[PDB]
Structure formats: C-alpha cells, structure tokens
Amino acid sequence: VNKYLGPYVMMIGKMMIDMMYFVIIMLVVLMSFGVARQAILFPNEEPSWKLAKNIFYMPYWMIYGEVFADQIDPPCQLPPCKTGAWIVPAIMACYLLVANILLVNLLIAVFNNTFFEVKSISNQVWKFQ
Amino acid sequence: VLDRVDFVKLLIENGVSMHRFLTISRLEELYNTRHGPSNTLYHLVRDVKKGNLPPDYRISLIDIGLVIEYLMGGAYRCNYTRKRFRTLYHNLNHFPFPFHELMVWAVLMKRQKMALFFWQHGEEAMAKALVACKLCKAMAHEASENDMVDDISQELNHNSRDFGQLAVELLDQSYKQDEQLAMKLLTYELKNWSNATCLQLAVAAKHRDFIAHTCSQMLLTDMWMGRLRMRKNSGLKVILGILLPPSILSLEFKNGRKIYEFYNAPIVKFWFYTLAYIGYLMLFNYIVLVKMERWPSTQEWIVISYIFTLGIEKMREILMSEPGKLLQKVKVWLQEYWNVTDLIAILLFSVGMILRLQDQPFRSDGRVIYCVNIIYWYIRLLDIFGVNKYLGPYVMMIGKMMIDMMYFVIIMLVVLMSFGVARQAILFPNEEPSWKLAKNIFYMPYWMIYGEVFADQIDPPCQLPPCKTGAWIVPAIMACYLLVANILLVNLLIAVFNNTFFEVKSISNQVWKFQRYQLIMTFHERPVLPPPLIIFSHMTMIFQHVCRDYGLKLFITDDELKKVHDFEEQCIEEYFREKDDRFNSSNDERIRVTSERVENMSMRLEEVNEREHS
Amino acid sequence: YFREKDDRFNSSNDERIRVTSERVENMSMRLEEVNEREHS
Ligand SMILES: COCC(CCO[C@H]1CC[C@@]2(C)C(=CC[C@H]3[C@@H]4C[C@@H]5O[C@]6(CC[C@@H](C)CO6)[C@@H](C)[C@@H]5[C@@]4(C)CC[C@@H]32)C1)COC
Numbered sequence: 001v002n003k004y005l006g007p008y009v010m011m012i013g014k015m016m017i018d019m020m021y022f023v024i025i026m027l028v029v030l031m032s033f034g035v036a037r038q039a040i041l042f043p044n045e046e047p048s049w050k051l052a053k054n055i056f057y058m059p060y061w062m063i064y065g066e067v068f069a070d071q072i073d074p075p076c077q078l079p080p081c082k083t084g085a086w087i088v089p090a091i092m093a094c095y096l097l098v099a100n101i102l103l104v105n106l107l108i109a110v111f112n113n114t115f116f117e118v119k120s121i122s123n124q125v126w127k128f129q
Numbered sequence: 130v131l132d133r134v135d136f137v138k139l140l141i142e143n144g145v146s147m148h149r150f151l152t153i154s155r156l157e158e159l160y161n162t163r164h165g166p167s168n169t170l171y172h173l174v175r176d177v178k179k180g181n182l183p184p185d186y187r188i189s190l191i192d193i194g195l196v197i198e199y200l201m202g203g204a205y206r207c208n209y210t211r212k213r214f215r216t217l218y219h220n221l222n223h224f225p226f227p228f229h230e231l232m233v234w235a236v237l238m239k240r241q242k243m244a245l246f247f248w249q250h251g252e253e254a255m256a257k258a259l260v261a262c263k264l265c266k267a268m269a270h271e272a273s274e275n276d277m278v279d280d281i282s283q284e285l286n287h288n289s290r291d292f293g294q295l296a297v298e299l300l301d302q303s304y305k306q307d308e309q310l311a312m313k314l315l316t317y318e319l320k321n322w323s324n325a326t327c328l329q330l331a332v333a334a335k336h337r338d339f340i341a342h343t344c345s346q347m348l349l350t351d352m353w354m355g356r357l358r359m360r361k362n363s364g365l366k367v368i369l370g371i372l373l374p375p376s377i378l379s380l381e382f383k384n385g386r387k388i389y390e391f392y393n394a395p396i397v398k399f400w401f402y403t404l405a406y407i408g409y410l411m412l413f414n415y416i417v418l419v420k421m422e423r424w425p426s427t428q429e430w431i432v433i434s435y436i437f438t439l440g441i442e443k444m445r446e447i448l449m450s451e452p453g454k455l456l457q458k459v460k461v462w463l464q465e466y467w468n469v470t471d472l473i474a475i476l477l478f479s480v481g482m483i484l485r486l487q488d489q490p491f492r493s494d495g496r497v498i499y500c501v502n503i504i505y506w507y508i509r510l511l512d513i514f515g516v517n518k519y520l521g522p523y524v525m526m527i528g529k530m531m532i533d534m535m536y537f538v539i540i541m542l543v544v545l546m547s548f549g550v551a552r553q554a555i556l557f558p559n560e561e562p563s564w565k566l567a568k569n570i571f572y573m574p575y576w577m578i579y580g581e582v583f584a585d586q587i588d589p590p591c592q593l594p595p596c597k598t599g600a601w602i603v604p605a606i607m608a609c610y611l612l613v614a615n616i617l618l619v620n621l622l623i624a625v626f627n628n629t630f631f632e633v634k635s636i637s638n639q640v641w642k643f644q645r646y647q648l649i650m651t652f653h654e655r656p657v658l659p660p661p662l663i664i665f666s667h668m669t670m671i672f673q674h675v676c677r678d679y680g681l682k683l684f685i686t687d688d689e690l691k692k693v694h695d696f697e698e699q700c701i702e703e704y705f706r707e708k709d710d711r712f713n714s715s716n717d718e719r720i721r722v723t724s725e726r727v728e729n730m731s732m733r734l735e736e737v738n739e740r741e742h743s
Numbered sequence: 744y745f746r747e748k749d750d751r752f753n754s755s756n757d758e759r760i761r762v763t764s765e766r767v768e769n770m771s772m773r774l775e776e777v778n779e780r781e782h783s
C-alpha cells in the first residue's frame with residue numbers, strides 16, 4: 001500500500017526469474033565439484049542416502065564465506081594419504097574462482113542493465129492496481 | 130566492354146533485347162576484353178590452372194566455370210562444366226536466362242555498377258544477390274592472401290556487404306508482403322545454382338543478419354518441429370510419447386505410419402538423446418560414488434558401452450564429411466572445441482579403464498582417473514542447455530567474459546605471491562630447501578581472500594616462544610593486501626563487466642540465432658536411436674552398404690515456380706518504388722531542389738528586368 | 744583537404760537555407776519594384 005514499498009516488491013518478483021536462470025548453472029558446477037571431492041576422498045563407502053547429502057551440503061556452504069581448508073583436504077602418525085588427494089585443493093580453488101567471481105558479477109551486471117524498464121513497468125502496474 | 134551503363138540502359142530502352150543479343154561467342158568476347166578497370170580474374174585463372182597457362186592465353190567458358198567452382202566452395206557445381214554444356218561447346222547458341230551470366234560476368238570483372246544494374250533485371254534476385262556476396266567474399270579473401278595493392282580487398286568486401294544488405298532488404302520486403310510465399314521462396318530448389326536453396330547459400334556466405342531474420346527463424350522452427358502441429362505445449366508431450374508409445378496416437382499431424390513420422394522428428398531425437406545422456410550421467414555418478422570391486426559391475430559395463438558407442442559414432446561421423454581427402458576431413462572436424470574436448474576425454478577414460486583392470490595400485494589410479502573425468506561430463510550439460518532460448522546466450526556471455534576475468538587473474542596472482550613470499554620469509558627463518566616451501570606461498574594467501582581470515586595464524590602471538598625479528602610487519606602487509614585485493618581489483622572487474630554487457634549480449638543473441646541452423650541439421654541427420662543402443666544402427670548401414678523431401682529442400686512444380694517468380698518480381702518492384710518515394714520526400718532533397726529552383730528563378734527574373742520596353 | 748572542406752561547407756543545410764532566404768528577399772524586393780511600374 002505504501003507509495004515506495006510496492007514497486008520494490010514488484011521488482012523483486014520480476015528479478016527472481018533472472019536469479020533462477022543462473023541458479024541452474026551454479027548447481028551444475030557445485031554438483032560436479034561435490035561429486036568429484038566425495039568420490040576422491042571416500043573410496044570405501046557403501047550405498048546409502050548419506051552419500052546424496054554430502055554432495056550438496058559443504059560445497060553449498062563454502063560459497064557463503066564458510067571455507068575451511070582443514071576439512072576440504074585433511075592433512076595426510078596421520079592416516080595414509082589417499083591416492084590423488086592433492087587434486088581436491090586445486091579443484092576447490094577453481095570452483096571458488098568460478099562461483100564467487102564470474103557468475104556473481106555477471107548476475108550483478110544483468111540486474112544492473114535491466115533496471116529502468118522494470119522500474120517503469122512496476123510503477124505503472126502499481127498505479128493501475 | 131567500355132563500362133557505359135547509361136548507354137546500355139538507353140539501348141535496352143530502344144528495342145535491344147538481351148535474349149537474342151547474348152550468345153556464347155559474344156560472352157567469350159566480353160570475358161576477354163581490356164577496355165575497363167583492372168581486375169584479378171587472370172590471377173585466379175592461373176592459380177586454378179596450376180600456373181601452367183601459356184603467355185597471352187585466351188580464356189574460355191570452362192575456365193570460368195572452374196574458377197566459379199573454386200570460389201563458391203566444395204560441393205558447388207557450375208553449369209559450364211556439366212556434360213551437356215561441354216558437348217554443346219565441343220560441337221560448335223542461346224541462354225534462357227542471359228542476366229544470370231551477365232551478372233556473374235560483372236561480378237567477376239569487378240564492375241559494381243553494371244552488376245547492380247543487371248541484378249534487378251530477371252528472375253531469382255535473392256539467389257543472385259547471395260551468390261554475388263559469396264563470390265565477392267571469396268575474391269576478397271584470395272586477393273588479400275597474395276599481397277595485392279591491399280585496396281582491392283576492401284573494395285570487394287564493400288561490394289559483398291552491399292549485396293548482402295540488398296538480399297536482407299529483399300527478404301524483409303517479401304516477408305512483410307506475404308509470409309507463406311516468402312517462406313516458400315527460401316526453400317525451393319534452384320536448378321540453375323547447383324541445386325541449392327537460398328538458406329544454404331546464406332549459410333555458406335555466413336550471413337548472420339539473413340539467418341537471424343524472423344522469417345528464417347520461423348522456417349527453422351517449423352523444420353525443427355517436424356510433421357507435428359503442436360505449438361502450445363511441447364516437450365512434455367514429446368517426453369510422454371517417448372516414454373509411452375501408445376500415447377503417440379493422440380496428436381495432430383500435418384497433412385501405423387504415425388510412429389515413423391513421430392520418431393523421425395528432430396525434437397523427438399533430441400529428447401531421446403537428452404534422456405539417454407541423463408541416464409548415463411546418473412550411472413556414472415553411481416559407479417564413482419560406491420565401492421569399486423575387482424571386476425566391473427553391470428552399471429560400469431553400461432557406461433563403458435555408452436562411451437564406446439559414442440566414440441565409434443564420432444569416428445563414423447568423420448568419414449561422411451564433405452571434403453575428399455581423409456586427412457583433410459580430420460582437420461575440418463577438428464574445428465569445434467567440443468569435438469577436441471570429447472576426443473581428449475574419451476582417450477583419458479580409455480587410459481583409466483585400461484589401468485583399472487589390473488592390480489590394486491593401478492586400479493586406484495584408474496578410479497582417480499574416473500573421478501577426475503566425471504567433471505567434464507558434468508560440465509558438458511551446458512551444450513544441452515544451449516538449446517533453450519534463454520540459456521544459450523548466457524553461456525556465450527560467460528565464455529566471452531572469461532577473457533576479461535583472466536586479464537585480472539594475473540595481477541591478483543602477482544600481489545598474492547608477493548604477500549605470501551614476504552610473510553613466509555619473515556616468519557620462518559630456519560628452513561631447508563623443500564617443495565613444501567613452494568606450497569605455503571599460494572595456499573593461505575589464496576584462501577584468505579574468500580572470507581577465511583584467521584588473525585591467530587597470520588601473526589601468531591609472541592611462556593610463548595620468542596618473538597621473531599620484525600614479526601609486526603605481517604599484520605600491516607596483510608591489511609594492505611586485503612585492502613588491495615578485496616576493494617580495488619574486485620570493484621574494477623565489476624565495472625569492466627558492467628560497462629561491456631550490451632554489445633556482448635547482442636552478439637551472443639545474433640550468434641545463437643545463426644547457430645540454430647547447424648543444430649537443426651545435425652539432429653535431422655542423426656539416427657533414430659540414442660548412443661547407448663546405436664549398435665543396431667551401426668550394423669544395419671553395413672548390410673545396406675553392400676545391398677530430403679523436406680527438412681533440407683522443397684521440390685515444386687512449374688506453375689508454382691512461375692507464381693513464385695511473379696511474386697518475387699512484384700516484391701522487388703515494390704521495394705525500389707518505396708526507396709525512390711522515400712528518397713524524393715526527404716527534407717534535404719527538398720531543400721536542395723528549392724535552392725536550385727530559386728537560383729534559376731532569380732537569374733531569370735533579373736534577365737527579365739534587364740529589358741526596358743518603356 | 745581544402746577543396747573537400749569547401750565542398751562540405753557549401754552543401755550544408757544551414758548555408759543552403761541562408762542563401763535561399765537572401766535570394767528570396769532580393770527577388771521579392773525586385774518583383775515589388777517591377778510591379779511598381781504601370782505602363783498601362
Ligand atoms: C543404509 O542402507 C540403505 C539401503 C538403500 C541404499 O540404496 C542406495 C541406492 C542408490 C542410491 C539411491 C543411493 C545412494 C546414492 C544415490 C545417488 C546419488 C545420485 O545423485 C544423483 C545426484 C543428482 C543427479 C544429477 C545424479 O544422480 C542420483 C541419480 C543419484 C543417485 C540418487 C543414484 C542413486 C543412489 C542409496 C537400504 O535399502 C534396502
């Protein structure tokens with residue numbers, strides 16, 4: 001009902017679609033990284049639904065500032081090092097660089113370049129409604 | 130021969146007819162003239178004849194046909210080199226369409242005004258424009274290859290651009306006047322142009338504005354949908370029909386046999402391929418997530434069969450290429466990055482599989498190879514996504530922005546390496562040479578710019594062991610490094626991405642619209658079975674080896690051909706009339722004509738006032 | 744260079760409008776003077 005708080009909600013509703021169009025690519029990259037890391041680090045697992053949870057959990061939490069290098073690649077007194085355990089930090093670095101630099105800035109540009117028409121349409125529709 | 134266009138027009142207006150004037154002898158005399166601007170025809174003829182022509186040689190029509198075949202492309206066949214014309218030429222007339230030959234001669238001899246005059250007289254104007262554009266492009270490439278005076282290339286490029294613009298404007302006029310006849314105009318077979326179509330000619334000339342037009346896009350949509358009339362809700366119905374074959378019989382078809390027409394549609398093949406690829410990816414995830422045993426399980430056998438069938442299909446698709454030589458076909462196939470990446474991934478998977486069926490260490494190495502290789506097949510889903518109207522240009526934009534990201538990665542690496550070397554050198558002054566030193570330089574400085582900052586480990590407090598000499602510089606250099614990395618470069622990159630978005634978006638949309646055609650043709654050519662079970666289709670063709678009604682062309686009769694020619698002539702006449710009417714009513718022309726008339730009127734009035742009859 | 748500059752300047756819309764206005768003014772004045780006479 002507010003003169004200023006209606007068009008903002010309409011803009012949010014109109015921008016959710018553009019956000020969803022990038023969520024899919026982000027999910028693809030995240031799932032690839034998670035599957036690679038889980039497969040490399042745990043080679044003696046049995047089929048269980050716990051496997052389907054470790055794919056998305058930590059890779060999703062890591063792109064919101066919750067990075068812990070002591071758990072992406074545990075040091076390896078210590079139990080013997082897994083075969084090819086050094087690829088995990090490299091793929092983690094590549095995944096972070098792709099997720100937090102390229103796609104986020106591209107989405108920012110997409111939001112920035114498509115603001116004027118959305119604002120005008122939202123104002124017109126609010127005045128009509 | 131003197132390039133007098135106005136005199137040619139005047140003589141045409143005074144009874145002269147090209148249907149009776151033009152003969153083989155007169156055309157050959159025209160092709161061997163010297164009273165005009167310099168051209169590059171003789172160099173092309175010499176190159177085609179392998180540089181073995183005698184001095185002051187006389188060019189015949191067969192040489193011109195060979196030059197045209199060389200310029201147009203691979204599969205193009207000129208009418209001069211056909212057997213009927215060779216028989217008629219060795220045993221000695223007339224030309225049913227003289228303006229075709231006249232325009233080709235004008236284009237080859239680089240007489241743009243004469244070619245423009247000849248273009249609007251006759252039938253099949255759009256095909257002539259496309260052929261002229263392609264010929265000019267090829268001639269410009271050839272001229273620029275062999276160190277000419279370097280301006281002939283730009284003149285030929287300008288001529289090609291002019292012809293392409295004319296073709297685009299004619300297509301726009303035709304679509305605006307009548308849509309169905311315009312679509313029929315783009316697909317009928319051209320018997321005089323090596324049995325090609327206007328769409329194929331436009332694709333061969335790489336004319337992106339022509340393909341990206343609305344009429345071409347809707348023609349491609351109709352071609353992609355096959356013989357199915359569904360437009361309101363596709364995809365779901367196609368998937369339902371694929372999963373439920375009995376459900377096929379509840380669809381509206383274009384004007385027992387429903388199964389054959391349904392399965393041969395490109396969209397159905399695409400959805401079948403997508404479902405098979407999704408299943409293969411699921412099986413790959415299953416085999417890499419669970420414990421691996423001594424011998425491959427059923428799912429591993431399935432994925433191996435899938436990858437092997439895909440490899441043999443890719444191998445067979447290289448032996449059906451247009452070029453003749455085997456080694457030439459390989460270097461033509463190896464022109465898309467996707468094919469090279471697929472070949473590399475297949476070879477790596479083969480190496481991993483070979484190393485997998487061995488003892489425990491080799492098996493572990495093969496498993497690690499599988500784990501590394503699954504990433505490429507996960508990433509490949511973007512190629513499938515590229516079919517969506519919205520998800521293709523985004524991928525193209527990502528590909529175009531990666532270069533700008535890389536141009537800043539280097540500076541970020543320089544700053545990071547400087548900080549890491551300084552910190553490691555200051556904090557650990559009693560180390561021995563080891564490769565562990567080369568790891569501490571990049572690890573923590575890189576992790577710290579993604580929110581993993583720990584002040585208790587950048588500068589440990591210093592009961593405590595004695596403080597290192599100059600250990601207080603580390604927090605200061607860390608603060609400076611954070612300020613530089615997370616404020617300056619990131620915001621500059623954001624600005625660079627923001628200010629270079631409009632042109633990238635437009636180019637991506639245009640290129641996606643252009644490249645829809647290759648996707649449609651590729652899925653029209655492909656068999657009716659997915660790669661996991663194409664083994665049936667790869668052996669049937671062997672037995673049939675020793676044994677395009679629509680989707681590529683459209684065969685039409687003669688009365689409809691006459692109707693199409695009349696429609697095209699009406700469209701071009703309307704286009705020229707509209708151009709003239711728009712030009713005559715502009716403000717600049719009115720001002721100029723008014724100024725000239727006022728000047729003449731003032732002079733005449735002064736002359737009139739000069740007389741004194743009183 | 745100088746010839747191109749002069750040719751571009753002479754064919755501009757503003758110069759054509761100005762010259763046309765001056766010529767029209769002179770022509771109107773001369774036609775009024777011509778109509779001023781009465782030989783009949
Ligand atoms: C404790 O004992 C439990 C046991 C039942 C365990 O059954 C297993 C059957 C395979 C299954 C369902 C299990 C774990 C990983 C699961 C994968 C995760 C994959 O993720 C997806 C992720 C996203 C997709 C793109 C790729 O695949 C799956 C296709 C994939 C997926 C769901 C295939 C299915 C796998 C559980 C008892 O039952 C009798």
Ligand SMILES: COCC(CCO[C@H]1CC[C@@]2(C)C(=CC[C@H]3[C@@H]4C[C@@H]5O[C@]6(CC[C@@H](C)CO6)[C@@H](C)[C@@H]5[C@@]4(C)CC[C@@H]32)C1)COC
Binds near residue numbers: 562564567
């Ligand atoms: C456990 O015992 C191991 C021992 C072998 C150890 O050899 C040492 C030889 C020097 C070497 C290779 C070592 C550690 C730091 C290494 C530096 C890191 C630098 O980084 C780079 C970083 C980026 C560049 C811009 C600057 O230099 C190197 C030029 C630099 C660099 C690679 C020079 C080489 C150094 C290992 C056994 O061998 C018999």
